[PDB]
Write a protein that binds this ligand. Structure first.
Ligand code: SF4
Ligand code: SF4
Ligand code: F3S
Ligand code: MG
Lengths: 267, 534
């Protein structure tokens, strides 16, 4: 499915919504066709691969056991309650799959807040015992680079992979294992509404003339001040980001944000 | 050479989420089928006790393929519970983002999820690009030249000669397959357009971000309307309009001609994958509280009786658990819903899925593009009638052909074409409203301590409903009943096969090791298991 030439990527889907996979399809300069044909060899990916069933399982085995080695990209949290039975693929639990494959990878990237920190299914009361990759597999020595967000900016995945392929090492990482080159600033310190924040100019409601005029969204719940991401700088889809669409940041690149940042419309 | 025995497809790839399909085949034909969904997350459990305003942010993470749709359903549900009537512009903006979602979603489905069931990409290397260009130019107003198609063939040749087939590794068409019928030229045209669609879908998704912040997972809806004041500006409207016009051109000149050419080559697929009953909720309202004000109207049809469309009664929905991994066997209306996981492993106590089994007046109902198209046709919708008749005329088949895997696939294209044109009508109405001086996009509201609410979306896969019970101003119960739950859930406590299970009976299987025929039918429903189970 691979051999020498392009580096092999094995992409796994655990407890996920496929929004992180969709974000990679939005890749821009390079676009996803360049990435799959020229940059990398995408050797397993359940959303887009041709093979199904036994043939897909054999594709996975061939990729994982390749003497050229592979990089793993992981989407979704790992459900660990009840011996992992809340998530299975090919009748194996996701915990077992990841425990067997991820220690064999040359590098692991946990892509999206679910894979990095546990995400939406780990919010209270966490009925499936979902965990992020590093938490679930600590004991096996797996240390995934965490690219957080729900979903992350795909600029940050491509930039991390390019860095790794050039330098054969991870870039500088923060204390949540996220690259500092993308996650070193709060959303707020990069926000165009910062002068209104400083002036104590807050929108009191979404229907208000203050919201119409672009006043700060802090009183309406904005988590920009406690959230590390590059959204105001890179934007999404080459055109917009939540505060420029008039909605507060909900904190989606932070651990446990579903419980820490709620209620989303309060500060 | 015909097989008797079981076949299991686990994972079913080229869907959203985690699906296991099991069939029994007798003499080369499927005799029995099971639809098993193998991931549970439990978002309904997680929502209990939270602020109703937070629900849309959680439920949007039901699914990133049908992104936005659940934020819209939850916001419609909480709008309804609080009794707010959102401003006209909020309805326009929400409707425009939804229209853009349908175009993105269906283009990606046909090329990137479905087409590898029917296109042998490696046979494109054998094609004559000059012949292929002639064929592509004869089916579309867009002119394609031999050199355009040679560029694609040259790129694919370098790819395959690397020995790293990537997403094509172990494809069912490698080496040839008796159920793959396209000639090399048609495989090259489809492959070229697959690759083209990888870049076009970037623009189709960007259209949603112009008003809606970002894709995936938009962030512009609130209870009472929308937040995006910039969406009123002529610059953002022009940006949306240009992305819409380019996406529409791809639908009309690339997707629909390819769909028709593949359909014509696989006309035997009019004989497999039919279903009996259809449900649809309507979409694109003028009035948020009247489903019959929607561009597509709601309706219910039993046993293909389109002369007697029945009104949609929301109280006749019950979700079964007898064959699902939940406690007990009692079906529930979603305002009395229960999500009590209890795993018994595959077929333990006759349970085999994490999906519930929704039934309407006790019947299993297909939802999605075929239900939306057939019911709107039967209601005299003039746009749907025009496109559907032209499609039937071009393929040379009668209306009965729509009750099939081919027909379902065609209906997805029909709905894409009709919605792509209707997005221009909505955009003009929105422009006209701003020009009248209406610049309001959000209305004020108050949270009740006790309330019931429901929000209805007809999403790209069909009828979506979110149901809330507010108690003490918090979420007392929140239940999602999602299109793929209808279509791909398991049997009910009357042991009725679900639409996907029933539609698989009769499927021929040429090679049990490479059961592409099962994939063709399953993929025609466009399954979404994160959606179906949540
Ligand atoms: S991080 Fe968010 S977008 Fe990505 S799989 Fe999880 S819920 Fe979906
Ligand atoms: S809108 Fe949010 S990120 Fe921007 S200045 Fe205000 S609090 Fe900070
Ligand atoms: S919600 Fe997420 S996408 Fe950026 S603006 Fe806030 S970190
Ligand atoms: Mg439900």
């Amino acid at each position: 499915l691979m051999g020498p030439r392009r580096p092999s990527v094995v992409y796994l889907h655990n407890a996920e919504c496929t929004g992180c996979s969709e974000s990679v399809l939005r890749a821009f300069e390079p676009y996803i066709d360049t990435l799959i044909l020229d940059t990398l060899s995408l050797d397993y990916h359940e959303t887009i691969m041709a093979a199904a069933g036994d043939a897909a399982e054999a594709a996975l085995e061939q990729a994982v056991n390749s003497p050229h080695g592979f990089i793993a990209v992981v989407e979704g949290g790992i459900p660990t309650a009840a011996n992992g039975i809340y998530g299975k693929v090919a009748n194996h639990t996701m915990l077992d799959i990841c425990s067997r494959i991820l220690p064999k990878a040359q590098a692991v990237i946990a892509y999206g807040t679910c894979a990095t920190f546990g995400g939406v299914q780990a919010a209270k009361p966490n009925p499936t015992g979902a965990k992020g990759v590093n938490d679930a597999l600590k004991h096996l020595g797996v240390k995934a680079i965490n690219i957080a967000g729900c979903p992350p900016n795909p600029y940050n995945l491509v930039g991390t992979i390019v860095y790794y392929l050039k330098n054969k090492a991870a870039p500088e990482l923060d204390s949540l294992n996220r690259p500092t080159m993308f996650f070193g600033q709060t959303v707020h310190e990069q926000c165009p509404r910062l002068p209104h924040f400083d002036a104590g100019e807050f929108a009191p409601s979404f229907e208000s003339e203050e919201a119409r005029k672009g006043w700060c969204l802090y009183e309406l719940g904005c988590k920009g001040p406690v959230t590390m991401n590059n959204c105001p700088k890179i934007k999404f889809n080459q055109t917009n980001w939540p505060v420029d669409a008039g909605h507060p940041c909900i904190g989606c690149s932070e651990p446990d944000f579903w419980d820490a940042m709620t209620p989303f419309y309060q500060n | 050479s015909s097989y008797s025995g079981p076949i299991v497809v686990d994972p079913v790839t080229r869907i959203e989420g985690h699906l296991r399909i099991e069939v029994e085949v007798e003499n080369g034909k499927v005799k029995n089928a099971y639809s098993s969904s193998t991931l549970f997350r439990g978002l309904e459990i997680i929502l209990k006790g939270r602020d109703p305003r937070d629900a849309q942010h959680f439920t949007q993470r039901t699914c990133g393929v049908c992104t936005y749709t659940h934020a819209l359903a939850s916001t419609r549900c909480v709008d309804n519970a609080v009794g707010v009537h959102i401003p006209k512009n909020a309805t326009y903006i929400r409707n425009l983002v939804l229209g853009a979602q349908y175009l993105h979603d269906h283009i990606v489905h046909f090329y990137h999820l479905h087409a590898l069931d029917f296109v042998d990409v490696t046979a494109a290397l054998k094609a004559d690009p000059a012949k292929a260009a002639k064929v592509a130019s004869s089916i579309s107003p867009r002119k394609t030249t031999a050199a355009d198609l040679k560029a694609v063939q040259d790129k694919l040749k370098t790819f395959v000669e690397t020995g790293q087939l990537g997403p094509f590794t172990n494809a069912y068409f490698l080496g040839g397959h008796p159920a793959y019928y396209l000639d090399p030229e048609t495989n090259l045209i489809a492959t070229a357009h697959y690759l083209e669609a990888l870049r076009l879908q970037v623009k189709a998704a960007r259209a949603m971000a112009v008003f809606g912040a970002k894709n995936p997972h938009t962030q512009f809806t609130v209870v009472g309307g929308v937040t995006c004041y910039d969406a009123l500006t002529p610059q953002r409207i022009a940006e949306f309009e240009a992305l819409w016009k380019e996406t529409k051109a791809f639908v009309d000149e690339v997707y629909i001609p390819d769909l028709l050419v593949v359909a014509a080559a696989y006309k035997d697929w009019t004989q497999y994958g039919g279903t009996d009953n259809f449900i649809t909720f309507g979409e694109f309202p003028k009035d948020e509280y009247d489903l019959n004000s929607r561009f597509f109207k709601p309706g219910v049809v039993f046993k293909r009786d389109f002369k007697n469309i029945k009104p949609f009664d929301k109280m006749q929905i019950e979700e079964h658990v007898r064959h699902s991994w939940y406690e007990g066997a009692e079906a529930r209306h979603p305002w009395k819903g229960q999500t009590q996981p209890k795993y018994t492993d595959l077929h333990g106590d006759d349970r085999y899925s994490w999906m519930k089994a929704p039934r309407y007046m006790g019947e299993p109902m297909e939802t999605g593009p075929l239900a939306q198209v057939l019911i709107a046709y039967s209601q005299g919708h003039p746009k749907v009638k025009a496109v559907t008749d032209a499609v039937l005329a071009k393929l040379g088949v009668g209306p009965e052909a729509l009750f099939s895997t081919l027909g379902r696939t065609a209906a997805r294209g029909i709905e894409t074409a009709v919605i792509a044109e209707y997005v221009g009508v909505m955009l003009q109405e929105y422009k006209d409203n701003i020009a009248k001086g209406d610049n309001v996009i959000c209305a004020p509201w108050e949270m009740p301590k006790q309330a019931e609410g429901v929000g209805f979306v007809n999403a790209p896969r069909g009828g979506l409903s979110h149901w809330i019970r507010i108690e003490d101003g918090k979420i007392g119960n929140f239940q999602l009943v999602v299109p793929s739950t209808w279509t791909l859930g398991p049997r009910c406590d009357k042991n009725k096969l679900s639409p996907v299970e029933a539609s698989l009976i009769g499927t021929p299987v040429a090679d049990a090791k490479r059961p592409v025929e099962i994939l063709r039918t399953v993929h025609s429903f466009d399954p979404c298991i994160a959606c179906g189970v949540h």
